[PDB]
Design an enzyme around this catalytic site. Structure first.
Site, PDB file in Angstrom:
ATOM      1  N   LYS A   1       0.120   4.436   0.019  1.00  0.00           N
ATOM      2  CA  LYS A   1      -1.243   5.548   0.333  1.00  0.00           C
ATOM      3  C   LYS A   1      -0.876   6.278  -0.559  1.00  0.00           C
ATOM      4  CE  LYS A   1      -0.149   2.924   4.908  1.00  0.00           C
ATOM      5  NZ  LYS A   1      -0.764   2.932   5.792  1.00  0.00           N
TER       6      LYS A   1
ATOM      7  N   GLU B   1      -7.244   4.473   7.593  1.00  0.00           N
ATOM      8  CA  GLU B   1      -7.713   6.009   7.107  1.00  0.00           C
ATOM      9  C   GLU B   1      -8.515   5.969   6.411  1.00  0.00           C
ATOM     10  OE1 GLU B   1      -3.531   5.625   4.905  1.00  0.00           O
ATOM     11  OE2 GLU B   1      -2.505   4.845   6.985  1.00  0.00           O
TER      12      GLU B   1
ATOM     13  N   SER C   1       2.520  -1.870  10.743  1.00  0.00           N
ATOM     14  CA  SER C   1       4.970  -1.726  11.134  1.00  0.00           C
ATOM     15  C   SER C   1       5.393  -3.035  10.519  1.00  0.00           C
ATOM     16  CB  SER C   1       4.620  -1.393  12.407  1.00  0.00           C
ATOM     17  OG  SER C   1       3.870  -0.370  12.462  1.00  0.00           O
TER      18      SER C   1
ATOM     19  N   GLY D   1       1.522   2.383  10.717  1.00  0.00           N
ATOM     20  CA  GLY D   1       2.502   3.284  10.318  1.00  0.00           C
ATOM     21  C   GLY D   1       2.852   4.166  12.134  1.00  0.00           C
TER      22      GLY D   1
ATOM     23  N   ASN E   1       1.068  -1.060   0.407  1.00  0.00           N
ATOM     24  CA  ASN E   1       0.570   0.192  -0.148  1.00  0.00           C
ATOM     25  C   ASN E   1       0.851   0.960  -0.053  1.00  0.00           C
ATOM     26  OD1 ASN E   1      -1.594   2.232   0.030  1.00  0.00           O
ATOM     27  ND2 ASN E   1      -2.545   1.874   2.161  1.00  0.00           N
TER      28      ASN E   1
ATOM     29  N   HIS F   1      -9.327   1.240   4.491  1.00  0.00           N
ATOM     30  CA  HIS F   1      -8.059   0.948   4.968  1.00  0.00           C
ATOM     31  C   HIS F   1      -8.743   2.044   6.433  1.00  0.00           C
ATOM     32  CE1 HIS F   1      -4.618   1.833   5.855  1.00  0.00           C
ATOM     33  NE2 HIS F   1      -4.253   1.211   5.180  1.00  0.00           N
TER      34      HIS F   1
ATOM     35  N   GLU G   1      -5.439  -5.573  10.431  1.00  0.00           N
ATOM     36  CA  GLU G   1      -4.072  -4.738  10.208  1.00  0.00           C
ATOM     37  C   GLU G   1      -4.234  -3.925  11.424  1.00  0.00           C
ATOM     38  OE1 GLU G   1      -4.129  -1.815   7.227  1.00  0.00           O
ATOM     39  OE2 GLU G   1      -2.326  -2.779   6.239  1.00  0.00           O
TER      40      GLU G   1
END
Ligand code: CL
Ligand code: CL
Ligand code: NA
Ligand code: NA
Ligand code: NA
Lengths: 250, 249
Positions: A11, A95, A212, A172, A9, A93, A166
């Site tokens: 992003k 985010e 991560s 992140g 990904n 996702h 996740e």
């Protein structure tokens, strides 16, 4: 045996010069038949990257909407993703769920529409740090997955789904799930499929870990019984991504 | 005098075949030199469309985010838009505000960022039917405009802004604003700019009207004193878009 699956990904990262260098590294790596590999660039780069990149590597949109066309300024559709020759999309996702407020039902609607267009889907689920501390990990994961499963009406449809677990607190932050934390989530996720999805889906569905993942930690995670691969964020922009794709090797 | 400005917002519509037929008619049309024309295709088509289209016609992204890179899966940045050679972005559209819940402040942060990156920006504002029926049109438009203006600190930045007034009740409903209703808001906005932006911005900034603009209604709207052009949605997919671009004539 489930084919191992590593998606990258990107992003909101990419440009012609950065993409070209990264794709050069990707094209030169050698991936065994036992590993399935996907990258997800920003939407503006999808068409050109799909044209130039070898077809053994998937090229996914990072998001799409839930109808083929309409009055949705800013959105793209699965038909548009197919029109540019791509076959995959990431949906749900964290985010998008958290920073952009997309609901469980919206993710479910998007997934059902993408599958109806012929796409494959990486469907993302996971719990926040506070939800985990309140021992709600399974409740939250199962709520997000159930909303999606409610729109998937046949077992054939599940063949084009990869589930990405996740933990929000691992995304992140540098703070990866321990190998025991990951295996424990993926195990109850697979059990949920055995109970709740059509017969056999539990044994075929890839459940990949994200949050991560790096080359320094990917090998122990990949030895976990119910981990089928990775969704890689920040590390997918670095040369070590090709090493993470070899996570199952010694 | 302000150059007439016509933009076509394709929204979520587009495919290689449909785009080709559209751009051909658009690349064959002839517009006078005092008309500025822009199209806004979905993000996946931006790069190839910008490569093949005569430079004088602008190509705008339909949305972007407020920093240049980061962990915002599904978003794109002004820097990416410039990298693929586009210099415009539509920000604050009714559909982003009212379907995706983009706040005034998020819109203002986006405009400031796109402007700092050197893009030109179509900033959209407008009131709902309920707001219009409560005589809240000017208060709503100013609230939305003022959030943006607070982050803009120079006439140079305002130079690259085009304000699109689009009554929400006129967007895709077939209920266009009358020439008189449009002029009334545009005149009020230009007055607000005279006191609330650096000197001379009011004389320069294009204020374009949007909401059910068609070839059938555009010329009378284009004759209003403070209407500098159009943001065109459904009609921008149709051959009559090139007629709308000729609305001043
Ligand atoms: Cl693909
Ligand atoms: Cl441009
Ligand atoms: Na190819
Ligand atoms: Na079953
Ligand atoms: Na002033």
């Amino acid at each position: 045996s489930r084919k191992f699956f590593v998606g990258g990904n990107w992003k909101m990262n990419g440009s012609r010069d950065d993409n070209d260098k990264l794709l050069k590294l990707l094209s030169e790596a050698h991936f065994d038949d036992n590993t399935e590999v996907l990258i997800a660039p920003p939407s503006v780069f999808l068409h050109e990257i799909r044209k130039s990149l070898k077809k053994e590597i998937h090229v996914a949109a990072q998001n799409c909407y839930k109808v083929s066309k309409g009055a949705f300024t800013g959105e793209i559709s699965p038909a548009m993703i197919r029109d540019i020759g791509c076959d995959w999309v990431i949906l749900g996702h964290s985010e998008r769920r958290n920073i952009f407020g997309e609901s469980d039902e919206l993710i479910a609607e998007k997934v059902q529409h993408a599958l109806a267009e012929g796409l494959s889907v990486i469907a993302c689920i996971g719990e926040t740090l506070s939800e985990r501390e309140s021992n709600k990990t399974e409740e939250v994961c199962v709520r997000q997955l159930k909303a999606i499963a409610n729109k998937i009406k046949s077992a054939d449809e599940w063949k084009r789904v990869v589930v990405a677990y996740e933990p929000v607190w691992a995304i992140g932050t540098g703070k990866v799930a321990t190998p025991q934390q990951a295996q424990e989530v993926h195990n109850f996720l697979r059990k949920w499929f055995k109970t709740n999805a059509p017969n056999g889906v539990d044994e075929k569905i890839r459940i990949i870990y994200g949050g991560s993942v790096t080359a320094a930690n990917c090998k122990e995670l990949a030895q976990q019984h119910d981990v089928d691969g990775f969704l890689v964020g920040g590390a997918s922009l670095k040369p070590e991504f090709t090493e993470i794709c070899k996570a199952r090797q010694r």
